[PDB]
């Protein structure tokens, strides 16, 4: 199907405990393939040269310094003291369709958890969150940064994502369907919980819903966040509280990429 490549970078100052830590992690969809950590690889990555690895190592080193200097600049923009710790995050990368062509590129930043600046979908213009980010925007417009970012996103990003998908196809292009069952747990004489499970699926995207008499139970469904199992796969469950004796009015519905057709499940006593 469709795929994404995304880098998640975190720079965090720590006054009195050295220079800010910089960590960059790269993903294809829900598979991490690279990590660089200033505080010191997928198999289909090792098959690239040691030259590929050096070139990316150099980039990580330069990025470390750029984000460190940016943290300094940002505390200035917000009139902040040197005493506190602050965080600069960024996400960049590309989404492609089944044919491998660019759907959309991304390059955006947050400071202390708050959106700061983002490259617009046009890959030519910026959206700044506040008067500080407007400084960054003006500097980046003057230095024609968006043109460099666009070149990466339309070129390097798409080209390498295509290569990774080809070299890592047995995993990256394999969707593993959820294994599903419904469990039943009495709460009292009067009510029981029905819990619909999805286990062992990849990628993480999934839809799990309960219906009662064919009606969506959005407000009455407890949905846990999709969670990693540790073996590349993910897990999720959805639960509803039902009156004793009424269990057969409830159906669990599962949609996932690895499924030929959606599942409809009920409790089977």
């Amino acid at each position: 199907g469709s795929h994404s490549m995304r880098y998640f970078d975190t720079a965090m100052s720590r006054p009195g405990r050295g220079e800010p830590r910089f960590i960059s992690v790269g993903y294809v969809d829900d598979t991490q393939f690279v990590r660089f950590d200033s505080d010191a690889r997928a198999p289909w990555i090792e098959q690239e040269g040691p030259e590929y690895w050096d070139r990316n190592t150099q980039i990580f080193k330069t990025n470390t310094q750029t984000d460190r200097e940016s943290l300094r600049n940002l505390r200035g923009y917000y009139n902040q003291s040197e005493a506190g710790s602050h965080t600069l995050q960024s996400m960049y990368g590309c989404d492609v369709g089944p044919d491998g062509r660019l759907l959309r590129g991304h390059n955006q930043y947050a400071y202390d958890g708050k959106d700061y600046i983002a490259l617009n979908e046009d890959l030519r213009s910026w959206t700044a969150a506040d008067t500080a980010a407007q400084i960054t925007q003006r500097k980046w417009e003057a230095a024609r940064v968006a043109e460099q970012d666009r070149a990466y996103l339309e070129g390097t990003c798409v080209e390498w994502l295509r290569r990774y998908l080809e070299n890592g196809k047995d995993t990256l292009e394999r969707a593993d369907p959820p294994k599903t069952h419904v469990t039943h747990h009495p709460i009292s004489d009067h009510e029981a919980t029905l819990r619909c499970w999805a286990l062992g699926f990849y990628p993480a995207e999934i839809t799990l819903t309960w219906q009662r008499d064919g009606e969506d139970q959005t407000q009455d469904t407890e949905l846990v966040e999709t969670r990693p199992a540790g073996d590349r796969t993910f897990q999720k469950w959805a639960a509803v509280v039902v009156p004793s004796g009424e269990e057969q009015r409830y159906t669990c519905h599962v949609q996932h990429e690895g499924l030929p057709k959606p599942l409809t499940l009920r409790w089977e006593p």
């Binding site: 970078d9 960059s24 980039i59 330069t62 750029t66 200097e69 940016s70 600049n73 390059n107």
Partner: peptide, 9 residues
């Protein structure tokens, strides 16, 4: 493949 961040904010 990573992208150079060569411009300070």
């Amino acid at each position: 493949h990573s992208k150079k961040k060569c411009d300070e904010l």
